[PDB]
TrEMBL record, chain A:
The chain holds residues 204 to 305 of 812 of the full protein. This is Uncharacterized protein.
UniProtKB/TrEMBL annotation, chain B:
Signal peptide: none annotated. This is Enoyl-CoA hydratase/isomerase domain-containing protein. Residues 6-30 form a coiled coil. The chain holds residues 359 to 388 of 1211 of the full protein. It comes from the Eukaryota.
Automatic annotation (TrEMBL), chain E:
The chain holds residues 98 to 194 of 1788 of the full protein. It comes from Trypanosoma brucei brucei (strain 927/4 GUTat10.1). This is Uncharacterized protein. Coiled coil: none annotated.
From TrEMBL, chain G:
It comes from the Eukaryota. SUPFAM superfamilies: Ribosomal protein S8. One of its GO terms (molecular function) is structural constituent of ribosome. Pfam families: Ribosomal_S8. This is 30S ribosomal protein S8, putative. InterPro entries: Ribosomal_uS8 (IPR000630), Ribosomal_uS8_sf (IPR035987). Belongs to the universal ribosomal protein uS8 family. One of its GO terms (biological process) is translation.
Length: 102, 30, 48, 390, 97, 39, 273
């Protein structure tokens, strides 16, 4: 259940194209890169890193159960911030390549 | 149990009647 | 009205008063047993 | 998904963001289209939706209402799944088109099951009868119309699941061509919602979808609206609203009986609103969520004597005719009963002027949940017992 | 922690200190499994539900069967012929073998 | 497999409502159960 | 040759797989392998199902049978009732002759704790909490002096004992009253204490011995399910004669017999027989 970033999607679409299997890239598209946008004049260009990174207030530390305080580095948390550079056009290109390949 | 020509009215009439008969069923059960 | 009290004496139908007759001892023992007996008989039969 | 620059939306900026004029909108076509797309999601589709930069408490609030929207929407998902299954089963046993199934009478059933029984097949006769009987109760396409529409509105209200509804790769009928659907049914439906239902934020609060600070403020916005359309002149001075008439029309926002009840000076008759219509006075109370703290909440008879003769002193109203009454509403949400007796009695509104002023009341079916039924019935406590219980 | 492990719910040294610190009421024989008669003021006045960490995505795997895979077969690992009497082996080896 | 083992975890009507049927109504395929056993 | 239960005679047009015997499809090793695995785990699944029906407790079975019994086609909404019928009633007691007044549950806000009790039952003396005067002394527990109250009141042949009221103490009382080691008991919702009624038979008590598990509160004994299972066994014969009471992780007060039944371990409280 790790949400693939844009880079990861790129890689998997490279594998799709070289394999020539469109049916992989389609499900991958449909699931993950749909809402992927381009950058416009009103867009803000490379988006700042917004994540807090994870801490505990003394009440969070003392009163919470053991698991709520358990931080293993989890890919999903920064996925937003891996995507902050807008590599979208690459994804669209790869996807063109696949639809051609299939 | 009331059969009509309109679906909405059949719907709510039958709901009402069914609930009524359930109440009476509780009295009878008593 | 007298005719209305004359009506009271008639035995219970389901057409008039919409209630089954009481008969008490059978209801006392077999009320909770009925599903069992019925499904032993292979369910009811809805005829027309 | 949520990105830098995403904001939780208020009602006014939702009305601003989606504003589009178009005439032909099936409420029941679109609602089901959007519904269907949400049921098509997998759980990861709910993942990144919370807005990136917020104070942490506010983030917690948004997490709460998001999780409740998702929980409600899935809770409805499985229900719809079963419903659709039953439609499909009737259409399979009868041989009728899957569209028409919902509108059938009981007559049609008495005939159809006669056919099926007389064809010797008993199992599918009983099956059909079951399917139809529950499809009668839950089948109307409008079944829960309001809370569904409020769900979708909630989703607009977060200003994050916006673009989750478009841009999918799709197949076809036997054409089976792969294309990309660029239609966004969401934007359509929400635009329709804003164009038609003006007060829908008020409704969204009446249904308890405001988990923090809920349904109080929307009630006074509602009452104030009602009064403004009722009378010819309304001054709003702070927490007090009056008429320029010389005849008594007065709406007083007194205290918030939620905090002020548990906060300080434990008391009995803590109320929320006061409304004076002329010779009638009405105390409007919102029930507390403590079943313990309700028993006090509505005023002692001595307090009603007191308020009555105090109004008599100040407003100059004759003490012969004064009728002072209580209205206490459900704690976390607002049902049909409460709104009807708010419209009809507190304000005097004949059915046609209410239907004029408030169109959506006909579609609004919400009723008391079993858990919440008893808020009205209160513990009767003896006077020699006062040291023990509140 | 205290729910699945009996050594944590020992009262008079671990849990006594913990409750004194957090400000719960506590006693020898109490209502809650650990040492405590009731919640503290903070725990009663504050919902900790969505506090403290986001919900791990892998949780989804419970409610959605779509995500239960096994990438490989049982013997694709090279053991396929283990069962001497399986139909698969009768098909692979043929009868005379 | 007992209590020491790792935990297993967890408006309208559901799909589990339909499969259910009254013992009063005659079932699907009339499998000749022995009365003693159903007892 | 009349046939009952066999439904339409000669069934309907069904041949067996082996008899009809359509020409066997040649699957690639893929098809065959997958058939073997899916039908293997199909059999596994079935074996599981049967084992689960075999091991189902009677209560589960009864709930199931009478749940199906009442089942209707539409899932009907609950009907609105009287303002309430569902308040748990207050257990009856007499005001005039009393150990303690039965306090209403409607007063639940008034109540205190075992440590700091709210003023009630003034006409009765109030039991005091028993605490150590110095370091070497044991640290007493409501269970410790619960057991010793009962033991001493049994030796003096008294009918009633006033005894400390805590969760596991009145738990212990309910269990003893289950096994019939005690005539009766009641909690009046008095904060400090509640009362137990002792049973005598043939001139001596029904209780041979009653002993607490721990002398301190600083010592806590844990009972493995196998231990509680050993107790039940007297050289091959099943012995329920002696009763052992214990806490569960679930805050239940149980005897060792139910504990062994569901295979849960618990913390020891006392033995009695």
């Amino acid at each position: 259940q790790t949400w693939p970033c844009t880079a990861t999607i790129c890689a998997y679409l490279d594998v799709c194209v070289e394999a020539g299997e469109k049916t992989w890239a389609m499900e991958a598209w449909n699931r993950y890169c749909t809402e992927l946008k381009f950058l416009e004049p009103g867009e803000v260009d490379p988006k700042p890193i917004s994540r807090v990174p994870f801490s505990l207030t003394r009440e969070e530390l003392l009163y919470l159960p053991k698991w709520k305080k358990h931080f293993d580095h989890d890919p999903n948390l920064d996925v937003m911030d891996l995507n902050r550079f807008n590599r979208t056009r690459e994804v669209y290109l790869r996807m063109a390549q696949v639809m051609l390949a299939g | 149990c009331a059969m009509l020509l309109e679906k909405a009215d059949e719907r709510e009439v039958n709901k009402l009647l069914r609930d009524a008969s359930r109440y009476e069923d509780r009295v009878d059960d008593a | 009205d007298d005719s209305d009290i004359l009506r009271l004496r008639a035995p219970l139908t389901y057409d008039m008063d919409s209630t089954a007759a009481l008969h008490v001892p059978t209801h006392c023992g077999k009320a909770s047993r009925l599903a069992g007996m019925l499904q032993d008989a292979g369910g009811v039969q809805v005829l027309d | 998904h949520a990105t830098y620059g995403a904001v939780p939306l208020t009602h006014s900026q939702v009305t601003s963001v989606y504003a589009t004029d178009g005439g032909k909108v099936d409420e029941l076509g679109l609602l089901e289209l959007v519904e269907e797309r949400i049921f098509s999601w997998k759980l990861n589709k709910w993942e990144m939706r919370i807005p990136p930069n917020l104070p942490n408490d506010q983030k917690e609030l948004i997490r709460q209402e998001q999780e409740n929207l998702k929980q409600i929407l899935s809770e409805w998902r499985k229900c719809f799944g079963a419903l659709n299954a039953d439609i499909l089963q009737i259409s399979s046993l009868t041989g009728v088109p899957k569209d028409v199934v919902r509108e059938k009478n009981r007559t049609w059933l008495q005939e159809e099951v006669a056919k099926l029984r007389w064809m010797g097949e008993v199992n599918k006769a009983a099956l059909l009868r079951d399917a139809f009987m529950r499809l009668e109760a839950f089948g109307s396409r409008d079944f829960m119309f309001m809370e569904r529409l409020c769900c979708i509105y909630g989703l607009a209200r977060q200003g994050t699941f916006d673009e989750a509804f478009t841009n999918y790769i799709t197949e076809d009928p036997v054409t089976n061509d792969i294309f990309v659907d660029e239609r966004n049914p969401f934007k359509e439906l929400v635009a329709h919602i804003v164009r038609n239902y003006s007060q829908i934020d008020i409704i969204y609060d009446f249904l308890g979808f405001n988990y923090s600070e809920g349904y109080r403020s929307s009630l006074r916005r509602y009452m104030e609206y009602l009064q403004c359309k009722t009378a010819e002149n309304v001054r709003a001075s702070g927490r007090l609203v009056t008429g320029d008439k010389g005849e008594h029309n007065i709406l007083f926002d007194y205290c918030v009986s939620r905090e002020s009840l548990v906060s300080g000076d434990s008391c009995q008759g803590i109320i929320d609103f006061l409304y004076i219509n002329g010779n009638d006075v009405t105390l409007i109370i919102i029930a507390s969520d403590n079943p313990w703290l309700r028993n006090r909440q509505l005023p002692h008879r001595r307090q009603m004597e007191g308020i009555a003769r105090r109004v008599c002193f100040v407003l100059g109203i004759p003490p012969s005719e004064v009728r002072i009454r209580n209205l206490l509403l459900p704690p976390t949400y607002l049902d049909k009963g409460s709104i009807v007796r708010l419209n009809d009695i507190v304000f005097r509104l004949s059915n046609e002027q209410s239907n004029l002023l408030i169109p959506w009341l006909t579609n609004y079916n919400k009723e008391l949940d079993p858990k919440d039924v008893d808020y009205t019935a209160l513990a009767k406590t003896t006077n020699e017992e006062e040291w023990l219980t509140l | 922690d205290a729910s699945n492990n009996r050594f944590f719910r020992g009262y008079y040294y671990g849990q006594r200190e913990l409750h004194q610190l957090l400000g719960r009421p506590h006693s020898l024989e109490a209502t809650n499994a650990d040492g405590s008669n009731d919640l503290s003021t903070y725990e009663a006045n504050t919902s900790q539900l969505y506090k403290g960490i986001p919900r791990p995505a892998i949780t989804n795997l419970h409610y959605e069967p779509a995500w239960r895979y096994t990438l490989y077969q049982a013997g694709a690992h090279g053991a396929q012929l283990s069962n001497p009497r399986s139909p698969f082996t009768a098909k692979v080896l043929g009868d005379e073998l | 497999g007992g209590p020491g083992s790792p935990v297993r975890g967890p408006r309208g009507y559901t799909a589990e409502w339909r499969d259910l049927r009254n013992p009063m109504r005659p079932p699907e395929f009339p499998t000749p159960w022995e009365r003693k056993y159903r007892q | 040759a009349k046939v009952y239960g066999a439904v339409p005679p000669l069934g309907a047009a069904q041949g067996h797989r082996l008899l009809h015997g359509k020409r066997e499809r040649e699957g690639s090793l893929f098809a065959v392998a997958n058939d073997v695995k899916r039908d293997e785990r199909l059999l596994r699944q079935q074996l599981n199902a049967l084992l689960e029906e075999e091991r189902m407790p009677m209560q589960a079975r009864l709930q199931r049978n009478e749940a199906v019994s009442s089942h209707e086609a539409v899932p009907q909404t609950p009907l609105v009732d009287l303002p309430g019928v569902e308040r748990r009633r207050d257990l009856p007691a007499d005001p005039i002759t009393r150990l303690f007044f039965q306090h209403k549950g409607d007063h639940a806000l008034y109540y205190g704790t075992y440590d700091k009790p709210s003023v009630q039952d003034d006409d009765r003396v109030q039991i005091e909490k028993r605490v150590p005067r110095r370091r070497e002394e044991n640290l007493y527990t409501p269970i410790y002096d619960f057991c010793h109250r009962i033991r001493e009141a049994t030796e003096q042949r008294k009918r009633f004992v006033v005894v400390p009221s805590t969760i596991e103490t009145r738990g212990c009382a309910r269990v003893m009253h289950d096994h019939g080691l005690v005539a009766g008991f009641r909690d009046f919702h008095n904060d400090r204490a509640f009362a137990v009624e002792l049973k005598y038979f043939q001139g001596d008590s029904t209780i041979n011995v009653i002993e607490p598990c721990s002398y301190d509160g600083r010592t806590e004994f844990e009972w493995s399910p196998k231990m509680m299972r050993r107790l039940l066994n007297t050289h091959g014969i099943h012995n329920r004669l002696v009763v052992y009471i214990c806490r569960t992780a679930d805050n239940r007060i149980i005897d060792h017999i139910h504990a062994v039944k569901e295979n849960i371990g618990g913390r020891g409280l006392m033995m009695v027989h």
